[PDB]
Design a binder for this molecule. Structure first.
Ligand SMILES: [Zn+2]
Ligand SMILES: [Zn+2]
Ligand SMILES: [Zn+2]
Ligand SMILES: [Zn+2]
Lengths: 331, 350, 330, 342
């Protein structure tokens, strides 16, 4: 079927992301089709080394490719990479796509990854105690959604639209009126990308225990997604080109906040599970299995040990979806 | 022979502002030079109406033999954020100023000219976020027509201008989200001045609300400001010079003063006559002479603050020391840059 | 009870113009309300100041004429010093004077008054006939200069501004957008109309053969009432206030190089301002208007030989209107 | 390598200009960066023009195909109101003017500056220096190209000089000084007030002949340099004699053949030269001065013609030659071209 990627030590965060980029036809074919002084050669070398990986992923009959070249080339925000250290896979995704678009521009090409993954918000402030309204465009490569106060994607996406009331003491300063005014601040989507990448905000820091911490809360997301209710236009239609998406990719994280393990479930343009060296078949077409493998949450574990005693302990599903990739229905 | 402006009832907020614009030569000569002046469709005519009536006023200020002019056309024409103006009601002089420069600029643009008041009065900040726990830095441009400085927690202009540069440290639980690193990171948020205007209008933030009393209030705190001002330490260049990667000097030309309570009270303008061959007090219909060249008078009329009043009553038989507040003080400072009729404000652009 | 102005030698061109500006209410009262490149600004304020003095004496004093010694000393024509015995073009004088007075005001803070009162503009239009483009720019004017040699009356020569010139054939207009020559009408419409409209009859020119300036004394009639609408941007556009009354005729009499200037002006009734003497006149009557201002040839009836010979000879009326001043009804 | 553009019939005038615009980086990256594009008629029209140029620039940057077929542009584009017959030849400069005007209108309407006017736009100071009187008259006149005379000069510098020398309005044809109210001998000249970042220069090779009822082409010899100093033709430069002003040649839009037909193509420099001839973008020897001369300067030569046997020698014209030169200023992606202004 497919070709894997060897893990150097703790580079599943590289693999899980690359493999997801590889499986977007537009980025695969885009990258393979390409014929401060140090930074320019760096970025091109990253693009150049990604090409090689893409080449071997298309070509090879071997079960996995070792990307020794990428590992030596890659730097994460300038500094050198310890291949035994785990890193935020999103942080890695952000560093790679910047560098690729930097590398393309540097060879007089149009910014591909920004085009395929880039959207923008209309940041709207509607003043309620005065007639002023303010908006600026703010760009995004990922949509970052709340996991701790919502149980599914649609509800957390609606939070962008609902906004926050800037009120009383915490009121918005209207520049024109020269006063504090009660005001809705919300974010609508102005430009929807051909590929919509969504981060489930599962990671944070525990002050009381001096360490990074993972929220494994239950959180569900659909196979088909309609973004119209969250767009500028859509909200205008309510208030007085394709807006539909299908799930194609799930980047999972499994284990602790500091370490743990990354892998990627992806559709064949059925579902395959890309886990470092081994790209296996899986039941992601089944909804219960989608639920157990990705939605997270608690359950009652039924523990046995030589199977003589039976314990019943609350367990966390510590394996769950971190990043969702959705493809626009006209793409 | 300076002409005043009639007060309709509570219109000193218009007069004080208008007079300050009239006395900026580039604006005066710019506005008077615009020919062809004499819903979406409604607003372009409205805005040109505003421009037209200002031209008229400016005309009479420049020419009339009278002690004052009565700008009825303007009063009838002017609408503050849509609503028609009740001439008996006091308003924030800065609101008025904002509404007025916006309308003028929109009139001039509709007529193919540049946004004159935005060119003369407009600057811009560089809103810089400097991450301390990661190598990232984020910058965006934000325009301003007025620079707004804190009066409560500072005692002079220079120190409160320094607050823009010193910034605020976004830390701990309140830490900045670096979107590339995808984590909370300790960060300095600050504003440096990117573009300095030929005329720099400065708001002393003297008004707020009291929830306990359900009324607007005035902070009459002491606050001093100099006659010459160097803006370099607060600019992008000047801070880049200090860190290691056109005139920046300014002369005080005007003080728009507010006197009395936050709800009502009274506005008037002290302004320099820009001359080759001094200060005058423009108070609605009477433009009187004044001692604003002297620092002690400047201090008493504009710097605000508390003092000990020698109060005399009981047909002069009782002297009492009561603590008093100077409720008359500077609200808006006008500063004019040292390298300041410019032909390029009148030229067609569209 | 009007006051005259003394002629220094050949300064009737000054008087004729000054007296014509004195009788414009808005210019009189405007001037009377005003109390290398460094010397230019100081020169101009001298000129304004000195005119104010003349305006002062014309109104207040009851002498038969004023002598403007200071204005003579002060006034310079395009940098150079005035020779008080040298005749000059009264329009040159007018242009140099209105420039100076507006330059003086602008420096003193006031707005340009004379430009306001006398200034108009043209929409300089080019209408391409062989392509769809049109080009318009705005030119300004203090006087309107009309052809006299090829027209017999004011309305028809004003009409010439509108008729324009056809830029055709080998002399065609380059359309900048199309990048080729195209047949084009170039015309001037009046964009802005001044409260006082001043109009030049183009009577003077040069004769290369004789090495001297020429005067054309051709017949040329002008009405007491003028409608300017047909010559305006808006009037032409409608078709495809603006009313004036005559208030002053600046006359020139005699030879082109020398000769003599005086001003007929309305008070209610016409008065002839001729240097020191301000006699009354019959300019209310149309035959006098015609004989004094319109020019043209006539058959002179000459008597000589102690009244024993009558001979008929063609004669030119060498006394005629040079500059008309019209005031806008409002 | 480079992507060509398909000729629709007689649309090499479109392709030759577009390609030259595509190769100006500040225009390329400027046009591609404009979002929100993807009397009432003209606002939609002009934005449509911009949008369809964006897709072309899209395909020229991206495509691995040998040429792109700009079907959307052909449907969209109108020349002075009328729909364009794709079989008709047109003046390449007439196309260029219509296109820059339209792009500037689209941009102004979207709140951005007039990009093409910022990059290609200069202005003259139309001076009139009265010699018989102390008056001087001056007005600003904008230009999108410099138009230079080919017939009475042999090279760029001498014909640029002509602008400075001017015409003497004298004798009966003397200038009317408004202030002096007389005719006065006067120099009328055009000096360059503002120099653009890209300088487009028209060589005036086309006119009408009245005898023969048809358009004609002057193929006279006219040479131009690779490096060009514009200081002596500017206001300040003449003010000396009484931002960089140096330019590098980056572009030559050539016309080949008859006045009313013929063929356009574009030699453009690689920021080494390349020949953009509709669908085929080929290497060329434009770095060599003999090749520059033979391909662009025009003029007559002695042709050596061979037939069967027969070796005749007939005088002949180079009917292939430069029409429009594109020079790029030495101090020239600029964010201030894409900022909001309205
Ligand atoms: Zn407001
Ligand atoms: Zn960071
Ligand atoms: Zn045309
Ligand atoms: Zn002259």
């Amino acid at each position: 079927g497919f070709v894997g990627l060897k893990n150097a030590g703790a580079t599943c965060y590289m693999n899980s992301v690359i493999q997801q980029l590889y499986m977007i036809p537009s980025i695969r074919n885009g990258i393979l089709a390409i014929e401060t002084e140090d930074r320019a050669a760096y970025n091109i070398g990253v693009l150049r080394h990604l090409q090689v990986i893409f080449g071997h992923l298309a070509a090879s009959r071997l079960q996995y490719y070792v990307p020794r070249g990428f590992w030596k080339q890659f730097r994460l925000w300038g500094e050198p990479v310890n291949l035994r250290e785990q890193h935020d896979a999103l942080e890695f995704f952000n560093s790679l796509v910047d560098s690729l678009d930097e590398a393309l521009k540097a060879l007089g090409h149009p910014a591909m990854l920004s085009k395929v993954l880039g959207g923008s918000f209309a940041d709207q402030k509607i003043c309620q105690g005065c007639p002023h309204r303010y908006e600026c465009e703010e760009s995004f490569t990922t949509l970052n959604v709340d996991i701790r106060n919502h149980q599914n994607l649609l509800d957390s996406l609606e939070q962008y639209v609902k906004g926050d009331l800037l009120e009383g003491a915490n009121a918005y300063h209207c520049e024109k009126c020269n006063k504090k005014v009660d005001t809705v601040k919300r974010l609508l989507i102005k430009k929807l990308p051909p590929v919509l990448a969504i981060q489930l905000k599962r990671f944070d820091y525990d002050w009381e225990r001096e360490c990074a911490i993972k929220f494994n809360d239950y959180f569900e997301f659909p196979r088909e997604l309609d973004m119209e209710p969250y767009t500028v236009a859509g909200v205008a239609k309510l208030e007085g080109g394709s807006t539909k998406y299908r799930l194609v990719g799930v980047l999972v994280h499994s284990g602790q906040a500091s370490g743990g393990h990354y892998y990627s479930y992806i559709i064949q343009r059925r579902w395959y599970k890309f886990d470092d060296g081994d790209v296996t078949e899986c039941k992601m077409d089944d909804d219960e299995e989608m639920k157990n493998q990705c939605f997270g949450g608690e359950y009652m574990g039924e523990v046995f040990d030589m199977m003589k005693r039976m314990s019943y302990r609350r367990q966390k599903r510590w394996w769950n979806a971190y990043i969702l990739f959705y493809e626009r229905m006209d793409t």
